[model samples]
Target: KPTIAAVGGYAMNNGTGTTLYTKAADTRRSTGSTTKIMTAKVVLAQSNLNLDAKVTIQKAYSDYVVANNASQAHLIVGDKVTVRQLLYGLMLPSGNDAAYALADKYGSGSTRAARVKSFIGKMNTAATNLGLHNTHFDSFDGIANYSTPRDLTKIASSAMKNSTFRTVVKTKAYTAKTVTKTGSIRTMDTWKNTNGLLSSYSGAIGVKTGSGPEAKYCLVFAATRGGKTVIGTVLASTSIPARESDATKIMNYGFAL
Candidate 1:
């Protein structure tokens, strides 16, 4: 057996045009928070990206957090936050509310529901443009989206081309200050990256982390070694530690190739 054995997961080299190994890499599975990668991608791809542009936190965003018991960036209602901060909030903490806020802000529609749908439409369009036949998003977050590992690597690879996207995802921690409704600046608690590999791996860069009852443990991971970068995804793994180990092995193997 070769070192590049095609196990029941997905891995690829970012520099090379070859898929190092794959197992069910084209089979669709629940994506969990990995969907946020595409969410951030769509927002970063905006025609006239105004990262400093502010968007007011809405009551509905907070309400959605409580309604779904989803993760949050703890954005204060009525406070104005910049798009740059929202990207940190969305990726560092995997905030579903932040995803909703971005979708509502960027998506072109008169109604919130319509805007969200439109944002997801953009995600699908991006996938289509990448020639990803097995990818589809029904939500801004991975709560209701599906994709194969191969398609996801393509998404992450394309997204990494953006300098801003690369900067945000590689960040280990960030603190944001926002304009409060009371005309004062409020400092938020540091948002930490959930991807353990950033600290553990020698050259881990980015991607995203995701887990759910259905999606299990999923990770879209990338790293650089000796000028070569490897990127890939692991879905439905047994546990967090397992996914990390899986990523480490795949990336190490990819670097060897």
Candidate 2:
């Protein structure tokens, strides 16, 4: 008996103009944190803003205060950290605070409320620039933002190419420093990448994962095998294992093609 198959993948020619492998390549499904691929790119492109450039924390970034279990970078008003580190904070820890900080820093006004729309605009514009036709951004932190599995696959494929972007996603862990007004540095928190596949699969580069009551379970994966890159997606599964399981099968099938 055959089990249900919830998966998709596509492979392109090696520096050649031809289709290599295409299986269920256009199907649509919910995309979880895989959206962060686009998020990270937009942020990086918008600013030469150094990740080490410290900016103070404000209420806009307070969203992480609760989700992080009151254990955020302890970002308070006047608290500062660099944009570079915040990228790690956002992508590595998947910290809510990191999202808010980016939004606040790049958003419209000097305040959180003012910058919300501006930040969101930047997010949507990013999708357009990247030629992600099916992708949309409804939220800066992606609490409300959503997309189809196919669109996220597009995002992951593009982001994985950038050495800087690729480096960040493949990072297994990170340690961020907090500085006091007294010019003292404190080792605040160490964040580990939530994408388990990084450790589980060989040649498995990062991508992102997301699950919520509405989004269910979603994953986007990129792998290089036989010197070829393939991208895959699985969206809105019932559980974490189901998401990874289906994605793994998809990749397995992808490799053979």
Candidate 3:
């Protein structure tokens, strides 16, 4: 295994699930915004998913982000954002508000809070279905919801199979043209990918980045070369650069395998 600075991590060959590297891969740790991979996964799994369906941005969504000082897409209070665009906002900007909005849209319930609870429930159920015993989600945007590097890599590998999730995470930037409440065009600020690996490392595709006081710096990363792909996760590194450096060493070893 390659040396890495992260507290826990795993890397694997995506096609055959061959182990490439690991460090405490089964030890659960704070997931931070990397939890949104599950959020996106649950939404994409909707039986009759309507990617074009529009979800109105509510004040509650913005308020939630403001309350936590979390990352957001700056979705307007009344600007109607499509499910597809919301996904881009969720992944590219690591948007907490988009997570809330998506939860409110997809979860089965009568109230926003109830719906959010239900959505988190869905995330847990999805984790269970994946045979991941250590993964859990108590919120849409992580809030340090826990998962193992082994568990997260499993989640991301399954998620990347969905064409929508693949496209959304790999995108570097997106400017959403939303419909205003009064039926006018409102061009929102462009959202940039938080996963710096996509730009810094060649052949890098995506996964997600996560961080917080508890989670430190975390990243789920994937890449392909010569028609082969490797996916991995690093949890609880010291900083953004440290996590990326850790992933690079781990993934370089993975590709070598």
Candidate 4:
């Protein structure tokens, strides 16, 4: 359970000059749900799905029966929600159900697998389109991709350019209206973002956090201070606190760059 830390920064006054502190920033590692950043990027690129558009809840997108291991939005079959709600549910809550639902709703097929695969392909395409050659998406839910600290910093920088994607990731809270296809309505569910840094850390814009038995704990962080922006990555930390601590350290150091 060792921790790895990396730092990178670019000054707004001179974008051409960039700095990388710690291990050159090319170290490769599992990115966990941080992959969602790319997923959202691709989805936003493909279609202008109205954030307020209502989508029907179906068995294929229902996450209730998926057992203890499934990432869920607590969405029930026959319930309906908006794309904006799903986006919040997907990123903030890290809901796999929301990811699959958005993929299936936008992708072609009776099942989510094909759509999820297609969506993941779009994610990889986003990485490539942004000149992020070293980054690749193995899955939309981030269960199967690996990336370098440098690549993730690049992705974060690129994603911040898209206004919609930027707004979604940095959101602290989301409230949406629920409507079924049959015209029935349900109670509104408000979702609070899961990024602890957003609420506690100063100048913390946002990014993502992820971990698994194999991936350990991974985090990507970006912050702006004194007109300078810094993005950092941490991978394979022994524990969650260690991962955040290492990322914080990297940010603190990079802020000086």
Residue 246, model 1, lDDT = 83
Comparing candidate 1 with candidate 3, which one achieves the higher lDDT? 3
lDDT tens readout by residue for model 4, 26-128: 6566677777777666666665567777677677656432743756676666767787778777877777777777777666555567766777777777778
Q: Where is the poorest 10-residue window by lDDT in model 4? A: 6-15
**Best by TM-score, which number?**
3
* lDDT by residue for model 2 (52-130), tens: 6788776556755575442244455556778877777777767667777877777777767778778888878877877
- Which of 1 and 4 is the better model by TM-score? 1
State residue 82's C-alpha deviation in candidate 3, in Å.
0.3
- The TM-scores of all predictions, comma-separated, are 0.96, 0.83, 0.98, 0.84
Off by over 4 Å in 3: none
* Backbone collisions counted per model: 0, 5, 0, 0
Best by lDDT: 3
Count steric clashes of candidate 2.
5
Model 3 Cα lDDT, one tens digit per residue, 149-230: 9999999999999998999888998999999999999988889998899999899999899997888999999999998899
Looking at candidate 4, what is the lDDT of residue 185?
71
Task: Look at candidate 1 and give me any clashing residue pairs.
Answer: none
Q: Is candidate 3 or candidate 4 better by TM-score?
A: 3
Candidates arranged by lDDT, highest first: 3, 1, 4, 2
Deviating ranges (above 4 Å) for candidate 2: 1-32, 63-78
